[PDB]
Amino acid sequence: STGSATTTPIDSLDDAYITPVQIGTPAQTLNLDFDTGSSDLWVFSSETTASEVDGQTIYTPSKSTTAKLLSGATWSISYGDGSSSSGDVYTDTVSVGGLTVTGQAVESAKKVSSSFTEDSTIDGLLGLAFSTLNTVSPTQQKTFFDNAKASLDSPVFTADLGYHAPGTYNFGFIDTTAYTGSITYTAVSTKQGFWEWTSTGYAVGSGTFKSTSIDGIADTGTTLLYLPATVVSAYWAQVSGAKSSSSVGGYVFPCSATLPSFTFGVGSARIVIPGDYIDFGPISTGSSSCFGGIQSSAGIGINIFGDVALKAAFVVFNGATTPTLGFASK
Numbered sequence: 342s343t344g345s346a347t348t349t350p351i352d353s354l355d356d357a358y359i360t361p362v363q364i365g366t367p368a369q370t371l372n373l374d375f376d377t378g379s380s381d382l383w384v385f386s387s388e389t390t391a392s393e394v395d396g397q398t399i400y401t402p403s404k405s406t407t408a409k410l411l412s413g414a415t416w417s418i419s420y421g422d423g424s425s426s427s428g429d430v431y432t433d434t435v436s437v438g439g440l441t442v443t444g445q446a447v448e449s450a451k452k453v454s455s456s457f458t459e460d461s462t463i464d465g466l467l468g469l470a471f472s473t474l475n476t477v478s479p480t481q482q483k484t485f486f487d488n489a490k491a492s493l494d495s496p497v498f499t500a501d502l503g504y505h506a507p508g509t510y511n512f513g514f515i516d517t518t519a520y521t522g523s524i525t526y527t528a529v530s531t532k533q534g535f536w537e538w539t540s541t542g543y544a545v546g547s548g549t550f551k552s553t554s555i556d557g558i559a560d561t562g563t564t565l566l567y568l569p570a571t572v573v574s575a576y577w578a579q580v581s582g583a584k585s586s587s588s589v590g591g592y593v594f595p596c597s598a599t600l601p602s603f604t605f606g607v608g609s610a611r612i613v614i615p616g617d618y619i620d621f622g623p624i625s626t627g628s629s630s631c632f633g634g635i636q637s638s639a640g641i642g643i644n645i646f647g648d649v650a651l652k653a654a655f656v657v658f659n660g661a662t663t664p665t666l667g668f669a670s671k
């Protein structure tokens with residue numbers, strides 16, 4: 342089997358991407374944030390504290406004839422930014438772009454933190470990291486991809502995020518019309534439960550390529566590109582007026598600037614992030630100071646190839662017995 346679904350930026354800055362997902366019988370369609378950096382599928386629901394729901398579409402398990410409460414199961418998760426959610430668990434039928442999984446764990450939120458409440462466009466998350474990260478207790482549950490894998494034509498999914506434009510998540514096949522040149526594959530460590538890999542280095546604009554190992558995770562659920570302080574300093578040094586602002590919480594730059602591209606290595610291959618991908622607009626409405634899309638990972642503990650990097654590529658998440666990651670230009 343295969344699946345194919347369009348993913349859409351939630352706003353004009355590509356802060357996140359949502360993808361329609363059919364849950365239950367009859368289908369309840371929710372727009373979920375596909376996150377290759379986590380492994381829970383959770384949703385706003387009829388069980389979510391009313392004051393914490395503000396415009397989201399909710400899952401009502403009582404209206405699904407295939408929903409079954411998973412007895413005694415709870416979940417609780419915190420994301421990289423400090424946001425969180427928790428609740429109980431149903432199993433139900435879940436379909437993405439024509440690909441259907443029966444008995445998928447659907448984690449129903451009883452509580453969500455303020456940043457989720459304030460984001461009316463995100464109805465929940467669909468985790469696509471390895472199932473070892475799943476937070477359901479006392480019996481850990483499998484991700485949607487994990488459940489679907491054996492039935493797929495090929496045990497893969499691909500991420501084709503758009504820049505200020507829609508894109509595509511495919512399951513079970515590689516669309517050879519969706520990229521240019523070849524796909525370069527690189528090794529993955531699953532030891533931490535992430536799609537963790539090592540980039541072979543970087544270039545800033547038309548500058549020479551620096552060969553250096555940069556370990557990081559491919560994380561569709563993170564907006565920006567977080568890289569070592571040395572690398573990030575080298576980038577913003579090429580932008581007149583750019584500086585790190587402690588009060589803003591990162592590198593900012595004059596909105597009148599022209600940003601240089603940023604290249605990262607995948608083996609001997611190179612992925613070029615155009616400069617305007619790195620522009621995340623005025624730090625506050627009406628400001629002429631803009632927020633940078635490349636930021637230091639120093640306070641994080643790991644490097645994160647978020648959407649700023651991934652949207653510049655066609656990305657293969659290969660879930661074979663020994664997982665790998667593939668990158669192609671597009």
Ligand SMILES: O[C@H]1CN[C@@H](c2nc(-c3ccc(C(F)(F)F)cc3)no2)C1
Nearest residue numbers: 376378379420421424456457460562563
């Ligand atoms: O957890 C790490 C693994 N993947 C990254 C991730 N973080 C989110 C996220 C989604 C929505 C929000 C909110 F709407 F603003 F609340 C916050 C964070 N989704 O994936 C970071």
